[PDB]
PDB file of C-alpha atoms and ligand atoms in Angstrom:
ATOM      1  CA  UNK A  24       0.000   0.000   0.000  1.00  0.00           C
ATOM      2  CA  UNK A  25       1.150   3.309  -1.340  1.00  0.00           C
ATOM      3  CA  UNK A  26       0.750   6.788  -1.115  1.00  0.00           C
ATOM      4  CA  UNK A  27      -0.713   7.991  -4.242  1.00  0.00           C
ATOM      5  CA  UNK A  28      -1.217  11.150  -5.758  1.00  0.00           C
ATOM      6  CA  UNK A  29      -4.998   9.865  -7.452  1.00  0.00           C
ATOM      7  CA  UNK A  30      -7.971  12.899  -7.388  1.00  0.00           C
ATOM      8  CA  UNK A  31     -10.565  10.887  -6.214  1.00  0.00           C
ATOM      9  CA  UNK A  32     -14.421  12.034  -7.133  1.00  0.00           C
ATOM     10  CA  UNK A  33     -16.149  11.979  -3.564  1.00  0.00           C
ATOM     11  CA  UNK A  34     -18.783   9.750  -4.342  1.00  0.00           C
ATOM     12  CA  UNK A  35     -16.004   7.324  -5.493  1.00  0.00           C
ATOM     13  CA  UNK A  36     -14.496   4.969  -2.992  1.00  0.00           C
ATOM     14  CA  UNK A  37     -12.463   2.505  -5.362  1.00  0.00           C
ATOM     15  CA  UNK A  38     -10.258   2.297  -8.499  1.00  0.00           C
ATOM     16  CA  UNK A  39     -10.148  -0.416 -11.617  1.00  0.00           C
ATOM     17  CA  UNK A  40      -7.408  -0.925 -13.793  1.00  0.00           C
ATOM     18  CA  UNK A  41      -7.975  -2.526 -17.449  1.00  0.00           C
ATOM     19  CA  UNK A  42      -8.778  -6.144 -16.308  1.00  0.00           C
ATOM     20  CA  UNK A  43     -10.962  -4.910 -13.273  1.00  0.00           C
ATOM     21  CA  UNK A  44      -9.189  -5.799 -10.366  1.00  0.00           C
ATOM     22  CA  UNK A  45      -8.557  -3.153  -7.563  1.00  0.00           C
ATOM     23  CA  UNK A  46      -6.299  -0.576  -8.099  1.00  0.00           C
ATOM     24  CA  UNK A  47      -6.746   2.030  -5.634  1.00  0.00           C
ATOM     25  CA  UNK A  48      -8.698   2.501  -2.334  1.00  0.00           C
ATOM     26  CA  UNK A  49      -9.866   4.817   0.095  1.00  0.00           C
ATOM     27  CA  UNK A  50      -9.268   4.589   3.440  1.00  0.00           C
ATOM     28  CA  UNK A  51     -12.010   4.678   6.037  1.00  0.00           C
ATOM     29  CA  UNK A  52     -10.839   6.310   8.764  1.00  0.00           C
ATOM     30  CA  UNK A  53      -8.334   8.793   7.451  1.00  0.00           C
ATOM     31  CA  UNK A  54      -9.490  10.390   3.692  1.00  0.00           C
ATOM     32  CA  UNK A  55      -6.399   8.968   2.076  1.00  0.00           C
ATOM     33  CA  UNK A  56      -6.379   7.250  -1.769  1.00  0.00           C
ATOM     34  CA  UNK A  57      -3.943   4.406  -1.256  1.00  0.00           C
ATOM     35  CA  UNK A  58      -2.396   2.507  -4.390  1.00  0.00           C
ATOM     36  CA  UNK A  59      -1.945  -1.074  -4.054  1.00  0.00           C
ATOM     37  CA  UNK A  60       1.195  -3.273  -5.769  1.00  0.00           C
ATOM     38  CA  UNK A  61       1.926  -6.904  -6.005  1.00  0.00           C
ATOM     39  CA  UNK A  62       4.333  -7.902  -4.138  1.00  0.00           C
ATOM     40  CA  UNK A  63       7.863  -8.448  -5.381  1.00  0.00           C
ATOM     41  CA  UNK A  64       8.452 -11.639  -7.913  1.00  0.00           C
ATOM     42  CA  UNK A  65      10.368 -13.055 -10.709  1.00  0.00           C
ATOM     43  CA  UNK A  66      11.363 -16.254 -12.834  1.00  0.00           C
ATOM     44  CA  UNK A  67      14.253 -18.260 -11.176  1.00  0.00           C
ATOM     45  CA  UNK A  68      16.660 -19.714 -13.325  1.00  0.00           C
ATOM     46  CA  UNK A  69      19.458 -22.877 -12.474  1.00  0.00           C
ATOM     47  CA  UNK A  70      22.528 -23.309 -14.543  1.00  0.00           C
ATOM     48  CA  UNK A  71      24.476 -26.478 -14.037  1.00  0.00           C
ATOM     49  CA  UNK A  72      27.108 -28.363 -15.943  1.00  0.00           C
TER      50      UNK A  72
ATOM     51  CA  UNK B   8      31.912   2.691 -56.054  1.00  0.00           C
ATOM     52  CA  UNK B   9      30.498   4.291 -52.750  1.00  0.00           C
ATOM     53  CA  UNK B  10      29.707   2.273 -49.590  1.00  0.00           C
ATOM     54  CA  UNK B  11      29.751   4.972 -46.860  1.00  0.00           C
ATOM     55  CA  UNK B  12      25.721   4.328 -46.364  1.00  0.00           C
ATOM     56  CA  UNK B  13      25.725   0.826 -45.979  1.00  0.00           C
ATOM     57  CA  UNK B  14      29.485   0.764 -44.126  1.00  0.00           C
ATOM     58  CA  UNK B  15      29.469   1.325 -40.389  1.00  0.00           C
ATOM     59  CA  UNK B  16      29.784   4.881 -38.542  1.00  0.00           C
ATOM     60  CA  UNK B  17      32.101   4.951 -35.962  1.00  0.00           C
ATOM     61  CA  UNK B  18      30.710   8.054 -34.444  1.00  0.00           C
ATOM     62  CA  UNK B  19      27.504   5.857 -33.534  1.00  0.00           C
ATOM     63  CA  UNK B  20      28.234   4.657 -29.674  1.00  0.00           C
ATOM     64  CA  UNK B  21      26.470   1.091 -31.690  1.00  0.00           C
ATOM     65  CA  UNK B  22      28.040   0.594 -34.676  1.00  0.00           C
ATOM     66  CA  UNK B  23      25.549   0.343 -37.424  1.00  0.00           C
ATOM     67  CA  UNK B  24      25.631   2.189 -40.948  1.00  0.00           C
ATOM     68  CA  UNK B  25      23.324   5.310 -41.661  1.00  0.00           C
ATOM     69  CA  UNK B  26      20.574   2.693 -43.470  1.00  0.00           C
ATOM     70  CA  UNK B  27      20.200   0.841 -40.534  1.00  0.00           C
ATOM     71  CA  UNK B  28      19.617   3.686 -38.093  1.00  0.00           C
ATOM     72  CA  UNK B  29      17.236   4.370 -40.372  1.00  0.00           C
ATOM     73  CA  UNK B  30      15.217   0.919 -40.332  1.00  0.00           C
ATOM     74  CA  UNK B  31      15.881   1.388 -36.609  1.00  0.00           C
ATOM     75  CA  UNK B  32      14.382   4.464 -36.235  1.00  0.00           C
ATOM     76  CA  UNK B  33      11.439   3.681 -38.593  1.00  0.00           C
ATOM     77  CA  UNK B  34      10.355   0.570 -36.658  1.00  0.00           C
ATOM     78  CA  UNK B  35       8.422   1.631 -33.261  1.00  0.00           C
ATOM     79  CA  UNK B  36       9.655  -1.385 -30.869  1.00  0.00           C
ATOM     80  CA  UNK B  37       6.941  -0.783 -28.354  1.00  0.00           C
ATOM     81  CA  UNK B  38       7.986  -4.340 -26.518  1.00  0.00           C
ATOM     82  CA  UNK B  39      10.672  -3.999 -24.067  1.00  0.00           C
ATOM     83  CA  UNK B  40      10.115  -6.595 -21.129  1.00  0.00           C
ATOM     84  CA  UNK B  41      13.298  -6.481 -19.558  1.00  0.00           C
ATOM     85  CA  UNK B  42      14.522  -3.073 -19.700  1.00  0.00           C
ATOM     86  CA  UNK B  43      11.622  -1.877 -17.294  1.00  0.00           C
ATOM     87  CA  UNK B  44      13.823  -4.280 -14.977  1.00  0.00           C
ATOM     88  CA  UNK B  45      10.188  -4.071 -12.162  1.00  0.00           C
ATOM     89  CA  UNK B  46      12.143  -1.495 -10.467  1.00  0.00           C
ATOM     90  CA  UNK B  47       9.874   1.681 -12.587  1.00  0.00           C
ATOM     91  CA  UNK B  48       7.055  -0.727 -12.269  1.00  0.00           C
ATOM     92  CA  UNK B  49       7.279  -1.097  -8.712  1.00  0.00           C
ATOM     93  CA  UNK B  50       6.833   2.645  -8.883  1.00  0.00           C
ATOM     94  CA  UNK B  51       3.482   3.227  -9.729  1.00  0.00           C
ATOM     95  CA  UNK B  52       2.327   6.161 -11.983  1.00  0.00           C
ATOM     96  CA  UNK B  53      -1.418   7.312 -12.568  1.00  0.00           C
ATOM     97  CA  UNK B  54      -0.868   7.021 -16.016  1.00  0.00           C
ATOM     98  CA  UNK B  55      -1.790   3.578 -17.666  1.00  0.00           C
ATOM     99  CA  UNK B  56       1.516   1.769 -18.554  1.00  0.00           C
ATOM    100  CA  UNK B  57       0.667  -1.854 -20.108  1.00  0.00           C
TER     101      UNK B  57
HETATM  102  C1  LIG C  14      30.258   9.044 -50.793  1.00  0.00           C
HETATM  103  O1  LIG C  14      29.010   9.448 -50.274  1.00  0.00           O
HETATM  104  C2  LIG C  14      29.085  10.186 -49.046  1.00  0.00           C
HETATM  105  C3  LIG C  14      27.653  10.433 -48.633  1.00  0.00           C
HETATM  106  O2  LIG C  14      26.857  10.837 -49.738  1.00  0.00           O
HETATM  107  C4  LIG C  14      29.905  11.469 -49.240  1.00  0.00           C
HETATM  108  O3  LIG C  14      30.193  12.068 -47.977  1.00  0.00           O
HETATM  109  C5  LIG C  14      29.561  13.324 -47.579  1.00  0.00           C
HETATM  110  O4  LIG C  14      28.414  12.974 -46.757  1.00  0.00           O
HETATM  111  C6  LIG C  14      27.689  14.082 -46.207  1.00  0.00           C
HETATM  112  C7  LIG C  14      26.631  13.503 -45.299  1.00  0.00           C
HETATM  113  O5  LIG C  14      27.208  12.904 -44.146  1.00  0.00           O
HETATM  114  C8  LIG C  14      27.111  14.910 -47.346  1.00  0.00           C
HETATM  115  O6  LIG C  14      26.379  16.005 -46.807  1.00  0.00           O
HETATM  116  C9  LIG C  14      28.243  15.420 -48.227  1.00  0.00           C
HETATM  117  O7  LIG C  14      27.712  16.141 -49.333  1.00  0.00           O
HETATM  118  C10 LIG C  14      29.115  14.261 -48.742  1.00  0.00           C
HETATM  119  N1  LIG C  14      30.234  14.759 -49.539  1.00  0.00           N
HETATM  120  C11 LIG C  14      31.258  15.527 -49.117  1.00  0.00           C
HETATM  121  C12 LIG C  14      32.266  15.888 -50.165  1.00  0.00           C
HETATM  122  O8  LIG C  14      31.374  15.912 -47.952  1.00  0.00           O
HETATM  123  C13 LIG C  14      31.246  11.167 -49.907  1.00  0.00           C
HETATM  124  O9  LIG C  14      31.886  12.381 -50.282  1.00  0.00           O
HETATM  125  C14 LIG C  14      31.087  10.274 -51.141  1.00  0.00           C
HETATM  126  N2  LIG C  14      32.390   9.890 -51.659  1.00  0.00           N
HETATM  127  C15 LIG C  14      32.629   9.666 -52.955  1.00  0.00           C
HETATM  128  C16 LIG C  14      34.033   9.277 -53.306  1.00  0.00           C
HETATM  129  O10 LIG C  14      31.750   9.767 -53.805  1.00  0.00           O
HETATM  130  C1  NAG C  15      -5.850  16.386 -13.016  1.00  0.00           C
HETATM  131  O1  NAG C  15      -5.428  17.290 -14.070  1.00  0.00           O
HETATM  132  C2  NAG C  15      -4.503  18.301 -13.641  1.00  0.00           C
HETATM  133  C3  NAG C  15      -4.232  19.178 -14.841  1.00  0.00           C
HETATM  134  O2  NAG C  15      -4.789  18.620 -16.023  1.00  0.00           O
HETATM  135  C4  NAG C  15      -3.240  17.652 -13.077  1.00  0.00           C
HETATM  136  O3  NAG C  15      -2.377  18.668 -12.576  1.00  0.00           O
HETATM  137  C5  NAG C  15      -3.594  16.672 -11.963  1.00  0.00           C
HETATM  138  O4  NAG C  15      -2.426  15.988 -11.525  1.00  0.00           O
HETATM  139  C6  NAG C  15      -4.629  15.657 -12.447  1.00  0.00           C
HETATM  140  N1  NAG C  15      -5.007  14.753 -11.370  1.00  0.00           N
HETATM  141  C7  NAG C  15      -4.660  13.458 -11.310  1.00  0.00           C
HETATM  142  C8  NAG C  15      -3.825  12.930 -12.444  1.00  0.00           C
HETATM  143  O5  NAG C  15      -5.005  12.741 -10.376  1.00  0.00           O
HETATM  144  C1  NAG C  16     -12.852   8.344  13.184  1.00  0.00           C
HETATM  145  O1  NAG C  16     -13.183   8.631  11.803  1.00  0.00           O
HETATM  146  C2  NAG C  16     -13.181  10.032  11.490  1.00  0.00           C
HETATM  147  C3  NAG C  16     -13.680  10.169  10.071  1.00  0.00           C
HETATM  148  O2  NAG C  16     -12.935  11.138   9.346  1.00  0.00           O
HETATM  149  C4  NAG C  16     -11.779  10.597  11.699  1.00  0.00           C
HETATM  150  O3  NAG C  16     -11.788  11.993  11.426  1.00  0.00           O
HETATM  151  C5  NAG C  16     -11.327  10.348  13.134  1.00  0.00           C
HETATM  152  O4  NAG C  16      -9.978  10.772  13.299  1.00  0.00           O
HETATM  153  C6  NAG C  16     -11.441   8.865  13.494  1.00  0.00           C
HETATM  154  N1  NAG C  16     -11.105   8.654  14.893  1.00  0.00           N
HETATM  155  C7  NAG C  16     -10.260   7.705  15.308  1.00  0.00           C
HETATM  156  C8  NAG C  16     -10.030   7.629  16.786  1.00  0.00           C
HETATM  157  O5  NAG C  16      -9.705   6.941  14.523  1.00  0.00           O
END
């Protein structure tokens, strides 16, 4: 979860990307638009003789 | 005969003749995995990168 820099609507509580999954939200408590990122990840490789 | 076009240019930092900077520049190559390297992904812009 990251700070984000997103001008909300104020009706609007949460964001879509292209293949509809969510984006950004709003938090709660606190009026704060709040990116969200998958976490860190990668192929793995093994060279051997 | 002259072959300056299709010889390579040493002031290029890649060395590739004036016809193929050409071909290079002419061709858009809009997929570059790699070169992102996750670290500008992991930064996240508003703008819709795909
Ligand atoms: C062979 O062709 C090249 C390119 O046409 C000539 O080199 C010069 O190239 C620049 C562009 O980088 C042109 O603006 C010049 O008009 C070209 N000529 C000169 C005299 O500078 C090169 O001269 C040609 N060589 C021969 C033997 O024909
Ligand atoms: C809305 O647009 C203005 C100017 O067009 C820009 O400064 C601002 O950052 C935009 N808001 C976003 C991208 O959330
Ligand atoms: C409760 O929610 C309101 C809504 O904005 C917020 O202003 C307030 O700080 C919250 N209080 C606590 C204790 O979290």
């Amino acid at each position: 979860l990251t700070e984000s820099n997103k001008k909300f609507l104020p009706f609007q509580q949460f964001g879509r990307d292209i293949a509809d999954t969510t984006d950004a939200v709003r938090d709660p408590q606190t009026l704060e638009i709040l990116d969200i990122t998958p976490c860190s990840f990668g192929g793995v490789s093994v060279i051997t003789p | 005969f002259n072959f300056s076009q299709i010889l390579p240019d040493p002031s290029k930092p890649s060395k590739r003749s004036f016809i193929e900077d050409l071909l290079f520049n002419k061709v858009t190559l809009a997929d570059a995995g790699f070169i992102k390297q996750y670290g500008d992904c992991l930064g996240d812009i508003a703008a819709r990168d795909l």
